[PDB]
From Swiss-Prot:
Gene: FGF1
UniProt-recorded name of the protein: Fibroblast growth factor 1
UniProt effect for mutating residue 103 to E: Reduced integrin-binding. Defective in integrin-, heparin- and FGFR1-binding, and defective in inducing FGF1 signaling, cell proliferation and cell migration
GO cellular component, one term: nucleoplasm
Residues of the full protein shown: 26 to 151 of 155
Function of the molecule: Plays an important role in the regulation of cell survival, cell division, angiogenesis, cell differentiation and cell migration. Functions as a potent mitogen in vitro. Acts as a ligand for FGFR1 and integrins. Binds to FGFR1 in the presence of heparin leading to FGFR1 dimerization and activation via sequential autophosphorylation on tyrosine residues which act as docking sites for interacting proteins, leading to the activation of several signaling cascades. Binds to integrin ITGAV:ITGB3.
GO biological process, alphabetically ordered: activation of protein kinase B activity; anatomical structure morphogenesis; angiogenesis; branch elongation involved in ureteric bud branching; cellular response to heat; epithelial cell proliferation; fibroblast growth factor receptor signaling pathway; lung development
Length: 126
């Protein structure tokens, strides 16, 4: 299990029990501990080890945590430069929607994310 730290604003990716996704600059926040399991080479689930909810992107680009693992919960994982990682919404991959956080640690919807943004960069951390 691990933490995922975003360069935009320096927030650990966090899935809150009400299925709200954001960042928190503040660790030991119970809901930043994530479990990444590989369904196939390069495709991951991101699961909260607290609420057991799965990261997911809806059709509008808005991150949310989900109680049942499905099509919306898969993310293609690409190892960066840099040592960071990017996560692309498998279901919405051919549109290039990434997981991203704004500097307030608030969700950055897929449509606005783009390679080169710091919003989309996450460090895997034990």
């Amino acid at each position: 299990p691990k933490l995922l730290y975003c360069s935009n604003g320096g927030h650990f990716l966090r899935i809150l029990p009400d299925g709200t996704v954001d960042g928190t600059r503040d660790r030991s926040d119970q809901h930043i501990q994530l479990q990444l399991s590989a369904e196939s080479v390069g495709e991951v689930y991101i699961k909260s080890t607290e609420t057991g909810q799965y990261l997911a992107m809806d059709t509008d680009g808005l991150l949310y945590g989900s109680q049942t693992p499905n099509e919306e919960c898969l993310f293609l994982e690409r190892l960066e430069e840099n040592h960071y990682n990017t996560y692309i919404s498998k279901k919405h991959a051919e549109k290039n929607w990434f997981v991203g956080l704004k500097k307030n640690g608030s969700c950055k919807r897929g449509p606005r994310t783009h390679y080169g943004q710091k919003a989309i960069l996450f460090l895997p951390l034990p």
